[PDB]
Amino acid sequence: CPLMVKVLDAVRGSPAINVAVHVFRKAADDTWEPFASGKTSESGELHGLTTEEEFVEGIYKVEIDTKSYWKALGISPFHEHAEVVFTANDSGPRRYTIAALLSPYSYSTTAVVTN
Amino acid sequence: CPLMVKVLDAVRGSPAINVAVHVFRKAADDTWEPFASGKTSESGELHGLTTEEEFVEGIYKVEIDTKSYWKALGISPFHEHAEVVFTANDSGPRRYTIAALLSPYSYSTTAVVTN
Amino acid sequence: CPLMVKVLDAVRGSPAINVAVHVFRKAADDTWEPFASGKTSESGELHGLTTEEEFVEGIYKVEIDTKSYWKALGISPFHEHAEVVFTANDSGPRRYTIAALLSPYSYSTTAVVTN
Amino acid sequence: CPLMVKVLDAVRGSPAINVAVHVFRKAADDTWEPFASGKTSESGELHGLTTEEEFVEGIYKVEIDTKSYWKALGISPFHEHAEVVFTANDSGPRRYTIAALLSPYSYSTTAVVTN
Numbered sequence: 001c002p003l004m005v006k007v008l009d010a011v012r013g014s015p016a017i018n019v020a021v022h023v024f025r026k027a028a029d030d031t032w033e034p035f036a037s038g039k040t041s042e043s044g045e046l047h048g049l050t051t052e053e054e055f056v057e058g059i060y061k062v063e064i065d066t067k068s069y070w071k072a073l074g075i076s077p078f079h080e081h082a083e084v085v086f087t088a089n090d091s092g093p094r095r096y097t098i099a100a101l102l103s104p105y106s107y108s109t110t111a112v113v114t115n
Numbered sequence: 116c117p118l119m120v121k122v123l124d125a126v127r128g129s130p131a132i133n134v135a136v137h138v139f140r141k142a143a144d145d146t147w148e149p150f151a152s153g154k155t156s157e158s159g160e161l162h163g164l165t166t167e168e169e170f171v172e173g174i175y176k177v178e179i180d181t182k183s184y185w186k187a188l189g190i191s192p193f194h195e196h197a198e199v200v201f202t203a204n205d206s207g208p209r210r211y212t213i214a215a216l217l218s219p220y221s222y223s224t225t226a227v228v229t230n
Numbered sequence: 231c232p233l234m235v236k237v238l239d240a241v242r243g244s245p246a247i248n249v250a251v252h253v254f255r256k257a258a259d260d261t262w263e264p265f266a267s268g269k270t271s272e273s274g275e276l277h278g279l280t281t282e283e284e285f286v287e288g289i290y291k292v293e294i295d296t297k298s299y300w301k302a303l304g305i306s307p308f309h310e311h312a313e314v315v316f317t318a319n320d321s322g323p324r325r326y327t328i329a330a331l332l333s334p335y336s337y338s339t340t341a342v343v344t345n
Numbered sequence: 346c347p348l349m350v351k352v353l354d355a356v357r358g359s360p361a362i363n364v365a366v367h368v369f370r371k372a373a374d375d376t377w378e379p380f381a382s383g384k385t386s387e388s389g390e391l392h393g394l395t396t397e398e399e400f401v402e403g404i405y406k407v408e409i410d411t412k413s414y415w416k417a418l419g420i421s422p423f424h425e426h427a428e429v430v431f432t433a434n435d436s437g438p439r440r441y442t443i444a445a446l447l448s449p450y451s452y453s454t455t456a457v458v459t460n
């Protein structure tokens with residue numbers, strides 16, 4: 001699995017469960033063609049987004065639907081979504097975890113890149 | 116001043132100086148229209164992007180060009196940029212400060228919204 | 231002003247107001263001695279803790295009383311407080327800003343150090 | 346395993362490997378008696394710190410030796426260590442993960458608490 005997503009909730013100290021995640025890749029014509037998506041699991045994780053064959057170098061965007069998550073808990077949020085835009089770079093063996101930590105008015109994201 | 120941006124560098128413990136910042140506003144046809152842009156000052160701040168008149172309700176995207184910054188420091192970062200997308204002014208006019216904290220493989224963003 | 235503290239609330243998107251802050255300095259016998267204390271203002275800032283004279287080289291601990299803050303908001307947070315421990319002034323006198331970003335189950339802290 | 350620690354490196358986008366972690370518990374006489382410790386693994390994790398029998402309600406401190414980590418990479422850091430102080434609360438089934446994300450001049454910590 002070359003690309004995983006992991007989301008945490010800073011208010012509840014828990015995985016952020018049932019969070020919608022969309023991944024896009026920059027296309028020839030500079031358009032963000034949908035690439036993959038899913039909903040975080042009970043552990044706050046989303047695996048199986050893509051395969052190594054499909055996950056070529058390129059610019060990618062991972063959009064995390066944070067606004068719907070906070071609405072489902074009844075907490076007024078600032079952002080429409082959290083967005084993580086990065087270039088995948090095919091330098092030998094590499095797996096990518098995009099982690100996000102959510103609060104109503106803040107978020108952090110980190111990339112954990114391993115061989 | 117209703118929209119300010121503040122950038123910090125988590126590696127040097129300093130303001131993130133001369134960082135490019137572009138603001139877009141979502142238009143009628145779900146296209147992102149250029150709204151305002153500038154560069155952070157020596158204090159890592161960017162003021163005077165807009166006016167209370169011009170800064171109507173809408174969905175805004177504040178794109179902070181973090182890759183060019185880290186590059187200029189001789190570091191190949193993970194992200195292309197930090198992007199913060201939010202509805203503004205939807206319960207009336209407010210003053211928004213968008214803060215970002217930058218590392219090569221991570222960033223954090225918070226909004227401070229006042230009367 | 232060589233030591234300032236800035237607190238933000240990631241849940242309300244506001245400064246974290248009236249937050250208690252205690253500073254200690256490590257003494258000769260590896261005991262923490264009371265150095266200075268105060269509460270954040272309406273802007274979430276705490277200035278005038280010390281003077282350039284009094285603020286000598288040493289190991290300092292800035293304890294931010296985050297539990298009492300979240301309690302006063304009706305939230306039972308994870309942490310007892312945020313604690314930031316650092317050597318100060320060890321390459322000469324500097325100006326230190328300790329920023330913290332608070333959620334119930336998470337916090338972030340950064341130092342901005344200038345001439 | 347009732348208490349785990351996980352540390353990430355924001356500069357390198359990697360687990361923070363071989364990082365010293367000490368856990369202390371507040372003692373009768375308000376002293377921080379060493380409770381457990383170890384070094385993060387290749388995955389940035391530390392498990393097996395304590396057992397459910399031993400991990401009673403109480404105030405705990407998890408000290409992460411961030412300064413030695415940054416020194417081993419040759420990057421000047423601000424903090425002496427990252428410290429996470431919290432009360433363990435014995436409310437039914439609960440496991441605690443203390444996650445920390447490190448940069449030279451900043452860190453974030455989060456508690457992920459599951460049943």
Ligand SMILES: O=C(O)c1ccccc1Nc1cc(Cl)c(OCCCCCCCCCCCOc2c(Cl)cc(Nc3ccccc3C(=O)O)cc2Cl)c(Cl)c1
Nearest residue numbers: 099101108109110121214216223331338444446453454455
């Ligand atoms: O990944 C697993 O496996 C994992 C598994 C399990 C758990 C976790 C796991 N992973 C995981 C763990 C964690 Cl902890 C994570 O957490 C990362 C969190 C990083 C957050 C840091 C944000 C700090 C922002 C402070 C900015 C302050 O700026 C300001 C300043 Cl300095 C001054 C002023 N005032 C002024 C003064 C003067 C003039 C104008 C202003 C003016 O107003 O601008 C205003 C501002 Cl706003 C993540 Cl992402 C992933």
